[PDB]
Design a protein around this nucleic acid. Structure first.
Ligand code: ZN
Lengths: 49, 50, 49, 288, 49, 69, 72, 497
DNA sequence: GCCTTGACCTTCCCCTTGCTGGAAGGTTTAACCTGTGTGCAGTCTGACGCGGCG
């Protein structure tokens, strides 16, 4: 439960939904990133990606 | 300090043995209330407005 | 306006007394740096004029 | 207040003692109900100063009338609490240790000085190899390194009449042995024979370093530590927020463990226990 | 990056050489890595993790 | 080069400000060094007047005071 | 002796016993090197008297007089 | 051949710095020793300390003997505490009575009284008196050594040599450094007499051009010999036997020293096993391990071996106590003493079960009444339990902010308030100067204005003069002239103050 | 406005019984049990230094 709750609530992925407009909601749901674990970092990146 | 000490020597009235921590509206902000809520422990007395 | 203490207080009470005057000091953070390096075995100090 | 210039140098043990007000002895910070300092801890008001403007620990002395008075009940001096910032403390140690900068940076400045490699010195300090202070005989040489088994070989060859050791204090007495002066003149004239590339460069570097030690008044054995300073508290605080939880500068941790190991060592030293445990505790201290 | 096994090659980091340097990598979901590669001087080499 | 022309300076406090502080403090410490506040940067740290602009007029005076006791 | 054994024999507790002791109303039992109140039989029966005297109603002082007679 | 492994690996250690590898590589050298190492090492320790208790016989020097300490223990009319349980106590080859002790302490006092006057008999080590001494000893040898107080008795001999030895050094401190002196000659005749000034001219018989210049410090060289002499006066023997006694107990204790080492090295892997069971992430490895090592030391320090059991388990639980204590004393910025700790541990063990069974976290009342104690203590324990929170924690999701930025010094000052106080003070003494000098001044000392201190009815009065009640009425009329709705208005603002 | 003059209030501290409760702090148990690690960290990267190795 510890690992699960800290994941759902302290990672860099669990973001507060944006209730500006429904568009904000659904496009924030239909996101893709490439950051975080098993992932990238801006200093480790260039331009080809 | 001796100065306000002297002042209360003139007038006499004091503070009690309790102080204020009252909440207030922040500076510059204004508006209208439409709701309140209370969350209270189990076993503790729910007061009048509670 | 940042660090000196005597100066900020004194000038507040000067300009409220219709005086546009200055009385600086020497900031705190410099002395903080001094203490921090004296933590390390350093005999830093200050030479008189 | 006003002045002209700045000066920099290493700090001798006498001076760091002078700077301090009272030694520290144990890692206690505060009581879990009476959030107040203990004695000879890290926040002891006796060393650092009062908690507030002209208030002692218990409250014996206040209101400016007992100006330079110390509260003999606890032993706390009465002044502002503005000296949370100023009064730094100190510590005595059991065995000395090395300042990491003055060996482990690029150029070591000390193995450099002695022409000695780096790994030899590490293998000394982590207690993997003895080394000669001084070869009392014409057999052996200074700076000569020994494994423990071959140390024993030479031991049962001689036993008494040499000087070798494993640890840091070895290096203390070692560099306390040498002299700047005649070695400087040596390398001065030694330059003249072959002023070829590496000869010239290294001789240059060393002679300059030596001369810098010479005229500066500094001394090399001051580059290691029988003493430490203790930074004042409010630069390393321990403070609540409104919810009641105390925040803590992680530095506090770095200090507190140190103390305990030191005095833990003084337990074992008061038993003359096997040197193995002693060795690994020294290692731990250096690492800390 | 998906798991599996990837190939690639660099454009002579020994630009002295100015020559291609092939290498190859495996990637599990979980565990340890490997890396095969050529040196400039025509020899295979290997490194874990 | 630029960076090491900055580092290799007759003072160090500007030098000890932007690159590889550790080495700088180490080399300065052994020799018994001392700065005499001729640059700008150092006079900024302390908070004194810079020896320039409006303030040259005063720092020159303090220089002849170094001459005049 | 050990102390709890004696106090569970006589019903008292170490706290009440030490009150009585501080009142100087019985023999002072010695300690040990560790600090355990070294009781005896004399201390046992003196304690029994000092107990039953206030039960009878002879007060602290008067029960102490009964005790110093028990020594006499 | 484990040091040979150190040789090669060190010859190509990959610049390792971790002491963990170092310590484990070192302790792995000396291998275990089982099922007879225990017993034969115990019997070596037996040999050592019983060579000591043999040495413990025959002290004309340490005349203060267990006879004397037996006068001590019964000096205050009684003792049954453990001082006697360390005393004579014959083991089969338990508070002692007075009868049993007086019986056991009679024959050794008999040997005392008969054994001394015979030492005079034509030699201190005369065969008849010396075999009487041997009876005293051998009679004491079936009996056991006696407790820590006997260390004083050994130290009471150390303090002899601590002086005696030192005095020779002290004499040497006046003798051997300043002028030339031989050393193939000095020791031999220093052993020769050692009692009177006889070897002096015997050594100067070489005619020694350095020796004749024995002046200007010699009234300290011979007065340093005189310290040795007045010690010969103090003791009463020219030692050659009790020095041998020092050798005897020296090797006898050294026996044990060397002995229980290899008991230490025997059982270190036990320590790391225990520790890494306890390495649940409270503190750190090595300090725990070192604590296990002191653990093992005191385990061996008092090991009965005739219980038949294996050393391991006895030692093991003593180790457990050491580390579970030290983890409690340390591992927090906040010292929480032990009983609160164990309460917490108990409590959490309980609540685990409670949330098995209820499918939920428990309520304080519930597990409290199961824990048989009222809610207040539980609640306070919970208020107290959690750790601090690391000032430099990043409240900023990225490295944009640390927590140490967003707090304030809610202690120091405020400038407007300083000006407030200053203007108030100006107004106050402005008002004072409008009133009479004596009255205003008397009020300054009454209330401490413009001075360090404060004074009261009788102090201020009898500084001025005796008056008490009319003084009160004087400050009252001072208020009356001061109430006065012309002067308040410079201070009416400070009614809000 | 100087002296009291006696009589009155209020507060703080200390003191008597017969213990009780609680905190803070100490020292010993015999079936036994012997070599981490433990999840990192994904390899940025170009100049400039420097150490061994030719
Ligand atoms: Zn106080």
């Amino acid at each position: 439960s510890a690992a699960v709750k800290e994941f759902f609530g302290s990672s860099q992925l669990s973001q507060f939904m944006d209730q500006n407009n429904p568009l904000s909601e659904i496009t924030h749901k239909r996101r893709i990133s490439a950051l975080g674990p098993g992932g990238l970092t801006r200093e480790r990146a260039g331009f080809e990606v | 300090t001796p100065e306000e000490k002297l002042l209360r020597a003139i007038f006499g009235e004091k503070a009690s043995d309790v102080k204020d921590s009252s909440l207030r509206v922040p500076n510059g902000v204004s508006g209208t209330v439409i709701d309140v809520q209370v969350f209270t422990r189990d076993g503790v007395e729910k007061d009048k407005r509670a | 306006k940042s660090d000196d203490v005597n100066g900020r207080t004194k000038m507040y009470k000067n300009i409220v007394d219709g005086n546009h005057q200055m009385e600086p000091g020497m900031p705190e953070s410099f002395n903080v740096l001094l203490k921090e390096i004296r933590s390390l075995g350093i005999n830093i100090e200050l030479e008189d004029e | 207040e006003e002045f002209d210039a700045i000066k920099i140098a290493l700090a001798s043990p006498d001076m760091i003692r002078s700077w301090s007000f009272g030694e520290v002895k144990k890692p206690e910070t505060i009581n879990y109900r009476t959030f107040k300092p203990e004695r000879d801890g890290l926040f002891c008001a006796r060393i650092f100063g009062p908690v507030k403007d002209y208030e002692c620990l218990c409250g014996k002395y206040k209101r400016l009338k007992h100006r330079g008075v110390i509260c003999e009940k606890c032993g706390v001096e009465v002044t502002q609490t503005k000296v949370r910032r100023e009064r730094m403390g100190h510590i005595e140690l059991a065995s000395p240790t090395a300042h990491i900068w003055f060996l482990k940076s690029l150029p070591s400045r000390i193995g450099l000085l002695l022409d000695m490699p780096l790994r030899d010195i590490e293998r000394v300090l982590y207690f993997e190899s003895y080394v000669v202070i001084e070869g009392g005989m014409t057999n052996l040489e200074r700076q000569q390194i020994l494994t423990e088994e071959q140390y024993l070989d030479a031991l049962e060859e001689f036993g008494d009449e040499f000087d070798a050791k494993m640890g840091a204090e070895a290096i203390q007495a070692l560099l306390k042995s040498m002299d700047l002066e005649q070695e400087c003149e040596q390398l001065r004239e030694e330059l003249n024979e072959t002023n070829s590339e590496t000869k010239r460069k290294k001789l240059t570097k060393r002679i300059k370093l030596l001369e810098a030690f010479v005229q500066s008044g500094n001394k090399p054995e001051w580059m290691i530590l029988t003493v430490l300073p203790v930074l004042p508290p409010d630069l390393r605080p321990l403070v609540p927020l409104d919810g009641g939880r105390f925040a803590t500068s992680d530095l506090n941790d770095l200090y507190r463990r140190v103390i305990n190991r030191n005095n833990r060592l003084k337990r074992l030293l008061d038993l003359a226990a096997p040197d193995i445990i002693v060795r690994n505790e020294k290692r731990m201290l250096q690492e800390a | 990056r998906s798991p599996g096994v990837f190939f690639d090659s660099d454009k002579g980091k020994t630009h002295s050489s100015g020559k291609v340097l092939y290498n190859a990598r495996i990637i599990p979901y979980r565990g340890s890595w490997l890396d095969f590669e050529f040196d400039p001087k025509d020899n295979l080499f290997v490194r874990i993790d | 080069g630029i960076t090491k022309a900055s580092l290799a300076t007759e003072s160090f406090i500007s030098a000890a400000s932007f690159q590889e502080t550790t080495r700088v403090l180490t080399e300065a410490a052994v020799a018994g060094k001392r700065d005499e506040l001729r640059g700008l940067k150092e006079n900024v740290i302390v908070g004194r007047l810079i020896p320039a602009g409006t303030g040259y007029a005063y720092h020159q005076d303090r220089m002849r005071r170094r001459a005049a006791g | 002796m050990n102390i709890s054994d004696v106090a569970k024999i006589t019903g008292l507790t170490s706290k009440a016993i030490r009150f009585y002791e501080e009142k100087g109303l019985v023999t002072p039992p010695m300690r040990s090197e560790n600090g355990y109140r070294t009781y005896t039989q004399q201390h046992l029966n003196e304690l029994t008297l000092l107990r039953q005297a206030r039960q009878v109603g002879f007060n602290l002082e008067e029960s102490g007089e009964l005790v110093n007679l028990f020594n006499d | 051949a484990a040091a040979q492994v150190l040789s090669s690996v060190e010859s190509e250690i990959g610049r390792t710095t971790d002491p963990v590898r170092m310590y484990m590589r070192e302790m792995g050298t000396v291998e275990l020793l089982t099922r007879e190492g225990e017993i034969d090492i115990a019997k070596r320790i037996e040999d050592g300390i019983n060579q000591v208790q043999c040495s413990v016989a025959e002290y004309p020097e340490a005349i203060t003997y267990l006879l004397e300490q037996y006068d001590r223990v019964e000096a205050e009319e009684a003792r049954l505490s453990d001082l006697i349980t360390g005393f004579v106590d014959p083991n089969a080859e338990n508070s002692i009575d007075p009868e049993l002790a007086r019986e056991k302490f009679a024959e050794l006092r008999a040997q005392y009284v008969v054994t001394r006057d015979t030492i005079k008999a034509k030699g201190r080590s005369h065969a008849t008196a010396q075999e009487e001494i041997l009876k005293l000893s051998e009679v004491f040898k079936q009996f056991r050594l006696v407790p820590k107080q006997f260390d004083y008795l050994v130290n009471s001999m150390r303090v002899m040599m601590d002086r005696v030895r030192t005095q020779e050094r002290l004499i040497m401190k006046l003798c051997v450094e300043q002028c030339k002196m031989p050393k193939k000659n000095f020791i031999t005749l220093f052993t020769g007499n050692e009692t009177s000034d006889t070897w002096f001219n015997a050594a100067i018989a070489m005619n020694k051009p350095w020796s004749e210049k024995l002046h200007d410090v010699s009234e300290e060289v011979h007065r340093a010999l005189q310290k040795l002499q007045q010690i010969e006066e103090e003791t009463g023997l020219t030692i050659e036997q009790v020095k041998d006694i020092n050798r005897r107990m020296s090797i006898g204790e050294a026996k044990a020293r060397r002995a229980k080492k290899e008991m230490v090295e025997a059982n270190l892997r036990l320590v790391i096993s225990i520790a890494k069971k306890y390495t649940n992430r409270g503190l750190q490895f090595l300090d725990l391990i070192q604590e296990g090592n002191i653990g093992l030391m005191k385990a061996v320090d008092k090991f009965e071996y005739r219980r038949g059991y294996k050393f391991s388990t006895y030692a093991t639980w003593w180790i457990r106590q050491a580390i579970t204590r030290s983890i409690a004393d340390q591992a927090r910025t906040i010292r929480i003493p032990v009983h609160m700790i164990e309460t917490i541990n108990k409590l959490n063990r309980i609540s685990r079960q409670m949330l098995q069974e209820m499918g939920r976290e428990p309520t304080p009342e519930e597990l409290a009444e199961r824990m048989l104690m009222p809610e207040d203590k539980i609640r306070k324990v919970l208020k107290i339990a959690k750790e601090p929170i690391s000032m430099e924690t990043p409240i900023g999701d990225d490295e944009d902010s640390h927590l140490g930025d967003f707090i304030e010094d809610t202690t120091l000052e405020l400038p407007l308030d300083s000006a407030t106080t200053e203007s108030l003070r100006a107004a106050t003494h402005d008002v004072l100067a409008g009133l009479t000098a004596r009255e205003a001044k008397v009020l300054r000392m009454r209330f401490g204005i413009d001075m360090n201190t404060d004074y009261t009815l009788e102090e201020v009065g009898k500084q001025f003069d005796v008056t008490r009640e009319r003084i009160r009425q004087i400050e009252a009329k001072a208020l009356r002239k001061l109430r006065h709705p012309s002067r308040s208005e410079v201070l009416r603002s400070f009614l809000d103050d």
